[PDB]
Short mmCIF file of C-alpha atoms in Angstrom, two decimals:
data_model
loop_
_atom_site.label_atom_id
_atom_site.label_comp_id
_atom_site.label_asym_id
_atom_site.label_seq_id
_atom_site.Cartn_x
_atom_site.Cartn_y
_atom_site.Cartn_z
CA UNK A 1 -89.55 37.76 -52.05
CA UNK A 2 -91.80 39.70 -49.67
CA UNK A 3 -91.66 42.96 -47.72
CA UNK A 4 -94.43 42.02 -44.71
CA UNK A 5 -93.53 38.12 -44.71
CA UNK A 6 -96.58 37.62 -47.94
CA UNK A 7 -96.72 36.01 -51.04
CA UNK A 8 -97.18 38.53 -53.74
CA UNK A 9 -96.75 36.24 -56.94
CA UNK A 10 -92.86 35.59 -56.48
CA UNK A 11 -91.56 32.28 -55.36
CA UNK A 12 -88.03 30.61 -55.73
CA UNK A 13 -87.07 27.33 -55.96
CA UNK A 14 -83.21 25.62 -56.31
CA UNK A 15 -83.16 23.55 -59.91
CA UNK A 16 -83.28 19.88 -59.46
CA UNK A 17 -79.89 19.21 -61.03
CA UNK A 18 -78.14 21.54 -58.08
CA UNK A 19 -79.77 19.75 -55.65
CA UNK A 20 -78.71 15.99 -56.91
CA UNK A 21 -75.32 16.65 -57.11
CA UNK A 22 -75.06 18.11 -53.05
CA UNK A 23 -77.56 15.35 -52.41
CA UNK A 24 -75.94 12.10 -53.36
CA UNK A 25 -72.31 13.95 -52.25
CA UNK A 26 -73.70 14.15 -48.07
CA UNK A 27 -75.52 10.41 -49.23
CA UNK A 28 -71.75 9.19 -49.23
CA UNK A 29 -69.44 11.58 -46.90
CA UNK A 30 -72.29 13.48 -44.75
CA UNK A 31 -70.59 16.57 -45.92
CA UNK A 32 -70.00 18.32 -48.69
CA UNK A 33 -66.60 18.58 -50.85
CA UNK A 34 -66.37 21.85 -52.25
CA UNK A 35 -64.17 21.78 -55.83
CA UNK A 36 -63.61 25.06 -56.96
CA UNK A 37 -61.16 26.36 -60.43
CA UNK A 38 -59.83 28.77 -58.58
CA UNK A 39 -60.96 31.91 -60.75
CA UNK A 40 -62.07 35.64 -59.81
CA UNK A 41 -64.58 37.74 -61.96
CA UNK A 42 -67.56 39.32 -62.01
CA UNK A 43 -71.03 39.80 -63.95
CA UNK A 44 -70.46 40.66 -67.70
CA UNK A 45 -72.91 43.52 -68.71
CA UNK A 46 -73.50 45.57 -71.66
CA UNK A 47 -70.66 48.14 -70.73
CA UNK A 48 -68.19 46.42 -69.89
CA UNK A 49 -68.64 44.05 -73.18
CA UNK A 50 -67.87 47.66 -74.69
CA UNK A 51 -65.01 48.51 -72.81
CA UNK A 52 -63.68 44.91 -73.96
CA UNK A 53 -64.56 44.44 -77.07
CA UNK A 54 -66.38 41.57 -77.02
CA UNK A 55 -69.40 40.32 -78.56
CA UNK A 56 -71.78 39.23 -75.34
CA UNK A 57 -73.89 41.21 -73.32
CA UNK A 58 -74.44 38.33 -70.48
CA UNK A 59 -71.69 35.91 -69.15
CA UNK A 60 -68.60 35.58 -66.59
CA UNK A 61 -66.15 37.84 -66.86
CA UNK A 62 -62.38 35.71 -65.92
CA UNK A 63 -60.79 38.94 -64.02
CA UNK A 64 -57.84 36.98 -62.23
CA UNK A 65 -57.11 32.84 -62.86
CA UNK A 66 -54.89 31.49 -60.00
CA UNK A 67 -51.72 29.64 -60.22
CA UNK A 68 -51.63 26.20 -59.75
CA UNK A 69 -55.08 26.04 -59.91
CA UNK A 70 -57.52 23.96 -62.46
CA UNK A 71 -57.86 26.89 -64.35
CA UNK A 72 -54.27 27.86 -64.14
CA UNK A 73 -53.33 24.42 -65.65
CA UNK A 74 -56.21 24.43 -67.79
CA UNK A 75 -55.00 27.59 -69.56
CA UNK A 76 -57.01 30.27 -68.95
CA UNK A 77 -56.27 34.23 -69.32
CA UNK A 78 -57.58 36.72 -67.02
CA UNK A 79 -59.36 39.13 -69.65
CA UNK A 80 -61.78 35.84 -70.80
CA UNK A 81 -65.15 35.19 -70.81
CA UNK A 82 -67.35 32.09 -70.54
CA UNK A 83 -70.09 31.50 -72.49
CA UNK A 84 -71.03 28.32 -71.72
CA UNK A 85 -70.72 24.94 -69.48
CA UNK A 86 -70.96 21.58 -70.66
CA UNK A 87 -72.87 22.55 -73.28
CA UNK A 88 -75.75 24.61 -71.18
CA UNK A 89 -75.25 28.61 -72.13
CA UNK A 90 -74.25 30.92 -69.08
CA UNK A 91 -76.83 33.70 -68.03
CA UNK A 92 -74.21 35.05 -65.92
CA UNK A 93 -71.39 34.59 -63.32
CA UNK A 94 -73.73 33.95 -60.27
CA UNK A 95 -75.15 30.84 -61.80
CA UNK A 96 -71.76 29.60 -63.25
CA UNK A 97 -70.69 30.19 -59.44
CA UNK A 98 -73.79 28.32 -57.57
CA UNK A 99 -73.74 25.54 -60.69
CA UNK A 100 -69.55 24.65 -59.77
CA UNK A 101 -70.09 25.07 -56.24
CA UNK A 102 -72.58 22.04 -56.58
CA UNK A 103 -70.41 20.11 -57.84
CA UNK A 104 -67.83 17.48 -56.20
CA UNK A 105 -63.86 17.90 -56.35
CA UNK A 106 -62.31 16.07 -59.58
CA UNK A 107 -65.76 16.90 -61.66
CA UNK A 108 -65.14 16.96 -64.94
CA UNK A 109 -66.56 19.65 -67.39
CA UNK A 110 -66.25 21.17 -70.53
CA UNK A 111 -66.11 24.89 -71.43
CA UNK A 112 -66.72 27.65 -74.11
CA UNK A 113 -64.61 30.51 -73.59
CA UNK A 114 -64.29 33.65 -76.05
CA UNK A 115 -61.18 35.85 -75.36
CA UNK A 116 -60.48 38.05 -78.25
CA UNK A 117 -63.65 37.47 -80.30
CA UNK A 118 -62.46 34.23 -80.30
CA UNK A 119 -64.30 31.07 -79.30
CA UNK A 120 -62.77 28.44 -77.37
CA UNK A 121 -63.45 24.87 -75.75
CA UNK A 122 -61.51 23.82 -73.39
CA UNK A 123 -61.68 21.33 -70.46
CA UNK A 124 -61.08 21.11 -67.23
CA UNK A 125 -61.28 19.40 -63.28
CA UNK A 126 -62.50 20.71 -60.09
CA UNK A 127 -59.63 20.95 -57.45
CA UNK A 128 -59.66 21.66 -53.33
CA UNK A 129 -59.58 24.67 -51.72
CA UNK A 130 -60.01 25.89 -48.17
CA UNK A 131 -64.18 25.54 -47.03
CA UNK A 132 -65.72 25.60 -43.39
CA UNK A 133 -68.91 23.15 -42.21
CA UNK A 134 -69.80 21.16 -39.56
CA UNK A 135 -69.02 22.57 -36.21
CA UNK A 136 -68.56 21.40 -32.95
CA UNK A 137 -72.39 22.27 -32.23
CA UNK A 138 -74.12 20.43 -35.31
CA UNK A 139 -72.60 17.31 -33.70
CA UNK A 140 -72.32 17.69 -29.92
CA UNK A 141 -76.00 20.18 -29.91
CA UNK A 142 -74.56 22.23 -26.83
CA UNK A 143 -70.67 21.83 -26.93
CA UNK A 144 -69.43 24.96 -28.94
CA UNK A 145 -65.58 25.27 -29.20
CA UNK A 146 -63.51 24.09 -32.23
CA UNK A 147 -64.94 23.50 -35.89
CA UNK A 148 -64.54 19.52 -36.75
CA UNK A 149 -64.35 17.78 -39.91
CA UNK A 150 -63.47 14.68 -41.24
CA UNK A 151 -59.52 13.41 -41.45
CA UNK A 152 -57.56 11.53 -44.60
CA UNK A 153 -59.18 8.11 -45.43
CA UNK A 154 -61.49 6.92 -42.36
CA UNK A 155 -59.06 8.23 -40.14
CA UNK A 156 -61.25 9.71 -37.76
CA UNK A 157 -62.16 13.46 -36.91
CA UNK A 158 -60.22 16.34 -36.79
CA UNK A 159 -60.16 19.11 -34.81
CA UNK A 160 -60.08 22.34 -37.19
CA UNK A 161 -59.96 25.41 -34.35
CA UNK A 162 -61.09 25.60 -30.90
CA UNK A 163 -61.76 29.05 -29.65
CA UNK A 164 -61.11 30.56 -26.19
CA UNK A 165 -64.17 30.87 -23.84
CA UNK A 166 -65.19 27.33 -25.56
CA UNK A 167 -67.02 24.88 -23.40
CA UNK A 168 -64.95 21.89 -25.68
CA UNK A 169 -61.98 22.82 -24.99
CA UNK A 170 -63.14 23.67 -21.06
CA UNK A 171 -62.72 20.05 -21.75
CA UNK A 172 -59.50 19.43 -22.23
CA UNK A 173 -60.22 20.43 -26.03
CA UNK A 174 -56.67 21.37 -27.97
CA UNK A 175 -57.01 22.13 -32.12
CA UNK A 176 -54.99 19.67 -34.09
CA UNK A 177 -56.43 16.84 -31.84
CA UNK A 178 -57.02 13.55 -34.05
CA UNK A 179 -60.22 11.46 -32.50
CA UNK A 180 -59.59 8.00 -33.53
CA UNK A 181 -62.12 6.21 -30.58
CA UNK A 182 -64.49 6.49 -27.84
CA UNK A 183 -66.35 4.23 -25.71
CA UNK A 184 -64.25 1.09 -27.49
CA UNK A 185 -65.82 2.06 -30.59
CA UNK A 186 -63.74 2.99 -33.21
CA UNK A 187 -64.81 6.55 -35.24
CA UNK A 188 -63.36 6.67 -38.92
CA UNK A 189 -66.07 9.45 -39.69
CA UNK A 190 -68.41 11.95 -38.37
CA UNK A 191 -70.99 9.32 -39.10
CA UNK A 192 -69.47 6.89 -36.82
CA UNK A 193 -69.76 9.70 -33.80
CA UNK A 194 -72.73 11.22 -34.36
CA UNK A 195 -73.83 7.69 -34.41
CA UNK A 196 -71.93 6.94 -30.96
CA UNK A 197 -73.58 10.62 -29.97
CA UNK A 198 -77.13 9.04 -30.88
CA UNK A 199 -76.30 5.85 -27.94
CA UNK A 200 -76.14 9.49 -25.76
CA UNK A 201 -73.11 8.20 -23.37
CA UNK A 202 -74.00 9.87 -19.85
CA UNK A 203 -70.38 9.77 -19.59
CA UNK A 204 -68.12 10.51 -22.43
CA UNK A 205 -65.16 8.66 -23.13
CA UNK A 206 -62.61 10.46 -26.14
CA UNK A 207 -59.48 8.31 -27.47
CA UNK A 208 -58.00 11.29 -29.91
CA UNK A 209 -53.75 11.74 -30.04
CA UNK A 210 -51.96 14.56 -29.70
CA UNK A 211 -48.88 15.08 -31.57
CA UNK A 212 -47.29 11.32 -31.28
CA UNK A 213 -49.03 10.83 -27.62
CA UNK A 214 -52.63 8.77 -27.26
CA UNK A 215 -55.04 10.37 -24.35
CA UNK A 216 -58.43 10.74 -23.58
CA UNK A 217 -60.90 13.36 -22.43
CA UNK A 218 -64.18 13.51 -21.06
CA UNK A 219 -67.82 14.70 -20.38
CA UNK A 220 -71.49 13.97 -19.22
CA UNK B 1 -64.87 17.65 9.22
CA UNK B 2 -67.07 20.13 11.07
CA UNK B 3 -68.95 23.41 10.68
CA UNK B 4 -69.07 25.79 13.34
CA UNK B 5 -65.07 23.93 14.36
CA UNK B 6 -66.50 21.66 16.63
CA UNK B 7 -65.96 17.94 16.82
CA UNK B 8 -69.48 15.85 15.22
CA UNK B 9 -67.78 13.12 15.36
CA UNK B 10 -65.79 13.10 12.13
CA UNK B 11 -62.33 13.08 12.65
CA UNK B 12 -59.61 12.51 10.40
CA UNK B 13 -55.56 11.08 10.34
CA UNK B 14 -53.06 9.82 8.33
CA UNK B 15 -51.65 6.19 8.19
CA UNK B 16 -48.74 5.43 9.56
CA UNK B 17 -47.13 3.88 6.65
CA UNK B 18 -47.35 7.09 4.42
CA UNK B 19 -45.96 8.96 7.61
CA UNK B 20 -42.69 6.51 8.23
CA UNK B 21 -41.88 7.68 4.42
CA UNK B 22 -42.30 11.31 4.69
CA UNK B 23 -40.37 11.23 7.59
CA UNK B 24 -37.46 8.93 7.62
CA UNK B 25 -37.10 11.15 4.56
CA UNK B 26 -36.65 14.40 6.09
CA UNK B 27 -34.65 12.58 8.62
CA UNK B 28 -32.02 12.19 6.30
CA UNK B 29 -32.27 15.55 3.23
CA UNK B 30 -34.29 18.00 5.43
CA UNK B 31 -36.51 17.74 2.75
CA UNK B 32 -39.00 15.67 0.46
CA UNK B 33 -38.02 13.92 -2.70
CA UNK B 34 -40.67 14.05 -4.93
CA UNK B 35 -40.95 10.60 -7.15
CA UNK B 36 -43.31 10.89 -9.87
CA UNK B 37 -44.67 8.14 -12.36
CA UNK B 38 -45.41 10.65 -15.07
CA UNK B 39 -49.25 10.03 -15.48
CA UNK B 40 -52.87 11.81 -15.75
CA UNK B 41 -55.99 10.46 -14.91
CA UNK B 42 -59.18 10.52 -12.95
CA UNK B 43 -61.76 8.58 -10.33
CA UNK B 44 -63.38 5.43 -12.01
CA UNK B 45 -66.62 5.56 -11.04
CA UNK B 46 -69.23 3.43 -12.40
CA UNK B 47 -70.43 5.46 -15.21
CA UNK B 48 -67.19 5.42 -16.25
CA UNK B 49 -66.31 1.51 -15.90
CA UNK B 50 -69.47 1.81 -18.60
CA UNK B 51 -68.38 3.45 -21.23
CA UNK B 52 -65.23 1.79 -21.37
CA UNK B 53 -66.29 -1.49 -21.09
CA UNK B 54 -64.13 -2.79 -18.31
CA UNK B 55 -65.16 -4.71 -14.52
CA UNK B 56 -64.38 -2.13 -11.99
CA UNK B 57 -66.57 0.06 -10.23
CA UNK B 58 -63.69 1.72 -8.07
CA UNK B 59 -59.97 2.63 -9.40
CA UNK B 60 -57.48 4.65 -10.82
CA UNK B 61 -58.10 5.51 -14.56
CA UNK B 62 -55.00 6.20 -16.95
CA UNK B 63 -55.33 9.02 -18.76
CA UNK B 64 -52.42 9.62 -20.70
CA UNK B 65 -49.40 8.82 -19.36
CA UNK B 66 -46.47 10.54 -19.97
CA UNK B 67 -43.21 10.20 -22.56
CA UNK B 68 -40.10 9.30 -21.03
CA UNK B 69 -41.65 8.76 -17.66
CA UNK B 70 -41.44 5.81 -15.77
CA UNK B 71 -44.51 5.03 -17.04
CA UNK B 72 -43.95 5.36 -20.62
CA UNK B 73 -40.76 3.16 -20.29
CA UNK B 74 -42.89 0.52 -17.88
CA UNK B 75 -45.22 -0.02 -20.53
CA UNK B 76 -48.46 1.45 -19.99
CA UNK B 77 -51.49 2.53 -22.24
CA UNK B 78 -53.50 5.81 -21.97
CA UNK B 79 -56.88 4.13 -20.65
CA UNK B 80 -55.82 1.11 -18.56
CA UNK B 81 -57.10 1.17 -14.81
CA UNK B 82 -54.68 0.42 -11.88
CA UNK B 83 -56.81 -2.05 -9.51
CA UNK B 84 -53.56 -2.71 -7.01
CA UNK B 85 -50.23 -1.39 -5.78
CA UNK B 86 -47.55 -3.49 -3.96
CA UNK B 87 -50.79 -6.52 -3.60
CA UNK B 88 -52.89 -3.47 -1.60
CA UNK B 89 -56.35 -3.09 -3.96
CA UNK B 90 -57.01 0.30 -4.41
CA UNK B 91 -60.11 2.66 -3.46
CA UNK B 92 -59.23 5.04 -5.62
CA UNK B 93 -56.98 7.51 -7.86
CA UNK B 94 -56.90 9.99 -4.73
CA UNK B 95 -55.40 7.40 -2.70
CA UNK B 96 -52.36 6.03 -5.01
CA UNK B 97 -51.77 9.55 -5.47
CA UNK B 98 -51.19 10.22 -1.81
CA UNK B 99 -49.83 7.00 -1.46
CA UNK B 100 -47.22 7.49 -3.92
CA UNK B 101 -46.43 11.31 -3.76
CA UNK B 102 -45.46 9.68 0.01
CA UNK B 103 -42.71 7.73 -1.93
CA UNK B 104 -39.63 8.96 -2.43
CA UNK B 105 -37.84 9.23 -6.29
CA UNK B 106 -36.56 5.40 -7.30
CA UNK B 107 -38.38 3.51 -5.16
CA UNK B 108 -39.28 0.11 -6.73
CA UNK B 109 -43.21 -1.07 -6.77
CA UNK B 110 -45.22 -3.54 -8.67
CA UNK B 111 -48.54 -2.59 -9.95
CA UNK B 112 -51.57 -4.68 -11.10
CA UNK B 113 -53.57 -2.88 -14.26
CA UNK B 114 -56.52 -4.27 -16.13
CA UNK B 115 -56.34 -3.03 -20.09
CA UNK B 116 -59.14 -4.81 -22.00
CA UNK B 117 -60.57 -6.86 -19.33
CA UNK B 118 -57.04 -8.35 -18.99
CA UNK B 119 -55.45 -7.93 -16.10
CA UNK B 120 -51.46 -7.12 -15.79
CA UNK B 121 -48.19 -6.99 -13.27
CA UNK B 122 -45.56 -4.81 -14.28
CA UNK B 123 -42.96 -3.59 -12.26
CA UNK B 124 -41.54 0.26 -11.74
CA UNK B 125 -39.68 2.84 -9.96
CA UNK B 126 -40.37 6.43 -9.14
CA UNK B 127 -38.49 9.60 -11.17
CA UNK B 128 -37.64 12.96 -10.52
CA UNK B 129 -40.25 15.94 -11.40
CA UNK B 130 -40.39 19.44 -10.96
CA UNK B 131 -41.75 20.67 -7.43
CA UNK B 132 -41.80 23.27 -4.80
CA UNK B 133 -40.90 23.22 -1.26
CA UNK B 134 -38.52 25.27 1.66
CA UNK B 135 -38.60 29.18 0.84
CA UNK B 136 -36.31 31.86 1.43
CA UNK B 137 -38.63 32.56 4.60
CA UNK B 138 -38.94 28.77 6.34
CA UNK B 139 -35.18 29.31 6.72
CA UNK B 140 -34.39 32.91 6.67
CA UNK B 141 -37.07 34.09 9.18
CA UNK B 142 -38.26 37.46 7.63
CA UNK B 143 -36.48 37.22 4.80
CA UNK B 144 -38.74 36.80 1.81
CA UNK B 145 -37.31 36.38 -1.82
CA UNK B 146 -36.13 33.46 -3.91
CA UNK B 147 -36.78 29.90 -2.95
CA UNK B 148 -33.87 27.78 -1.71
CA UNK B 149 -33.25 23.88 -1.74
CA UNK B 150 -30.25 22.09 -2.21
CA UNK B 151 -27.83 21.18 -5.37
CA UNK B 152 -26.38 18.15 -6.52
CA UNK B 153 -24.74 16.66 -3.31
CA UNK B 154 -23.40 18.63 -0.84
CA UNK B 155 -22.72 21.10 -3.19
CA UNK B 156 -24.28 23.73 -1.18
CA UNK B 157 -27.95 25.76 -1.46
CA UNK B 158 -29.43 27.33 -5.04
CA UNK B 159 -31.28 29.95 -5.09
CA UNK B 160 -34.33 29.35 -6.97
CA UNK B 161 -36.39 32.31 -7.99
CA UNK B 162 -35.72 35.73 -7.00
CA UNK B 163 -38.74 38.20 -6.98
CA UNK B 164 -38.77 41.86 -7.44
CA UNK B 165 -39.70 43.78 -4.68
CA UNK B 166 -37.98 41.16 -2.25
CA UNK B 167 -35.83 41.90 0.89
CA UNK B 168 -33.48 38.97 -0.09
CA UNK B 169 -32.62 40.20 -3.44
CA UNK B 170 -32.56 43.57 -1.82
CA UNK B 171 -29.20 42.45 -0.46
CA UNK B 172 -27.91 41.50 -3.75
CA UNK B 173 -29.40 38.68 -4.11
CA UNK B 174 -30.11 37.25 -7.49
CA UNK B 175 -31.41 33.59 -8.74
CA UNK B 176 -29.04 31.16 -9.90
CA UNK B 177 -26.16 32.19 -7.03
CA UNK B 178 -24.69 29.05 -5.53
CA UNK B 179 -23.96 29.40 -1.74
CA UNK B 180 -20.83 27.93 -0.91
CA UNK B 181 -20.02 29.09 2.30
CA UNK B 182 -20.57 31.28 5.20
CA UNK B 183 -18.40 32.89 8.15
CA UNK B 184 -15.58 30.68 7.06
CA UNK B 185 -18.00 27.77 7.47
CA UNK B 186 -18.50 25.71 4.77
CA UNK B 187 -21.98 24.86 3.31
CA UNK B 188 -23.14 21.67 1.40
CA UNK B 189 -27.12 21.55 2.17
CA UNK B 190 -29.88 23.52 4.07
CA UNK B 191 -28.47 21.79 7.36
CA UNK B 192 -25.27 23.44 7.49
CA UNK B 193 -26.99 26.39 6.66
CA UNK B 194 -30.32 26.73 9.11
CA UNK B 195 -27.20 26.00 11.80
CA UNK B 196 -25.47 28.53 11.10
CA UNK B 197 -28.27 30.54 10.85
CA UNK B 198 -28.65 29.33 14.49
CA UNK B 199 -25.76 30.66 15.85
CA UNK B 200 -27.26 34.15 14.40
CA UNK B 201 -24.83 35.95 13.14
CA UNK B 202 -25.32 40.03 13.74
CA UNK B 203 -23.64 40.36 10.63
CA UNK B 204 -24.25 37.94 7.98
CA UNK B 205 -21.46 36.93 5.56
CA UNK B 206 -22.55 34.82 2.06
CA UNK B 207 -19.93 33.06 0.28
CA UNK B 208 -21.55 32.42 -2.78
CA UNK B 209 -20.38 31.79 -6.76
CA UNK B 210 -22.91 33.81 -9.73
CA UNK B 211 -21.61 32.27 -13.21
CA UNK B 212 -17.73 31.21 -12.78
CA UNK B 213 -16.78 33.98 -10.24
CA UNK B 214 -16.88 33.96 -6.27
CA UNK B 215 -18.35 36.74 -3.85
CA UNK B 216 -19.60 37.63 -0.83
CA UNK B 217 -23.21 39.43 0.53
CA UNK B 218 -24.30 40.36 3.67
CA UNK B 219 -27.23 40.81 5.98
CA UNK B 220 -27.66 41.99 9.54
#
């Protein structure tokens, strides 16, 4: 924190523990897999702990679970608060939020609830959801157009949206596109085509599939 | 070739061959018959030949052919490269383009490819499409509005597309209309038709058919 770019005592830093977990996830998939409970809330302060009854004057405040979510299964009631996770207390929602969105889908974890003055454990598995990363620039360094992320198994990359005035597409670049080779190399992965990028083809050979078809495009 | 039109010693013509097609065609329809192979593609250059691994500095890249087209149904793979056509290497995709649009619809060829450094015959014959050719003005004289070709066999002349603002229409013309007939002279293609229009009728009488009904327009 600074006003005039300056160090005036206050630094921050992001806990080791954070940083493992979206470490060793990229080590394995160059991306991140975001698991989420599917949950709403906000910070519990003093008031509201009055207005609800409750014995806690810092935590996360469960507004809304979702259906068919983790927590949804789980068994959670909107109206709850957590108090701790796997053990470690909970200063308050933000962490709780930063501490999950570290973590990898299927995670499992173990919670202290309290809804009506009433402790509770329960546990519980991080699910999908509906993220956005990697674009079509942190790859191709120039070629903006449609966002691109990884497809099934090692199946390859898929196209996520290509936009209008977008140089990819200006390419013959369609969303929904499947890129299963180039240059007789086979691409499972962003890894394998950023690693294909790296060999920096003058000339550009895609083997994606539309629909049930098998084409190619091109560039230089 | 020349700026400032004046002859530098460039000149251009076309082959024979393609010629004898294009006409002995007319020669017998009036008009061209557009066989199509149902394929995309692009030059092979060098750069090219490259990437994709393959001994061929000049030819005719595949794309992605088509489904249902007489490619599909021949057999052919989305990145193969055509090196001859009836035995006669080719230069290039602009020439087997030419070369074929010449053709007209069902005529037989044999082709030589070269998928995977492994070269290949196959045999195939030219399909229909979806082109454009002889307006409502190459026949009519003045008369702008819908284009005209034939229909079926000597079924007569359909009217292709109608504009708005068109003279034609402005008669009561309107797309889809099957000319039958004209000054109690029948009318089964553009021939019988451009002749009577050479006789020039003062008044023009159309015997023509819109859904299952018959009527008549006129012109002068």
């Amino acid at each position: 924190l600074a006003p005039d770019g300056g160090n005036i005592g206050i630094g921050f830093a992001i806990p080791s523990n954070m940083v493992k977990n979206l470490t060793s996830q990229m080590v394995e998939y160059g991306q991140v897999k975001r698991g989420e409970l599917g949950i709403m809330g906000t910070e519990l302060n003093s008031e509201l702990a009055k207005a609800m009854k409750v014995d806690a004057q810092r935590g996360a405040f469960v507004s809304q679970v979702l259906p068919n979510s983790s927590a949804a299964k789980a068994g959670i009631k909107a109206g709850d608060v957590i108090t701790s996770l796997n053990g470690k207390p909970i200063s308050s929602f933000a962490a709780l939020r930063a501490q999950v969105g570290t973590m990898p889908v299927g995670s499992k974890l173990t919670l202290g609830l309290l809804r009506d003055g009433k402790q509770v454990n329960v546990n519980l598995e991080l699910q999908q959801s509906s993220q956005n990363q990697v674009d079509s620039s942190s790859i191709f360094n120039g070629i903006e157009g449609a966002e691109m992320s990884n497809k099934g198994k090692d199946q390859g990359v898929v196209v996520n949206n290509v936009k209008t005035g977008t140089p990819a597409a200006q390419i013959g670049l369609k969303k929904g596109d499947v890129i299963i080779g180039a240059n007789q190399q086979a691409v499972k992965n962003i890894a394998e085509l950023r690693k294909v990028l790296d060999s920096k083809p003058s000339v550009l050979a895609l083997n994606i599939q539309r629909g049930d078809s098998t084409i190619y495009l091109l560039m230089q």
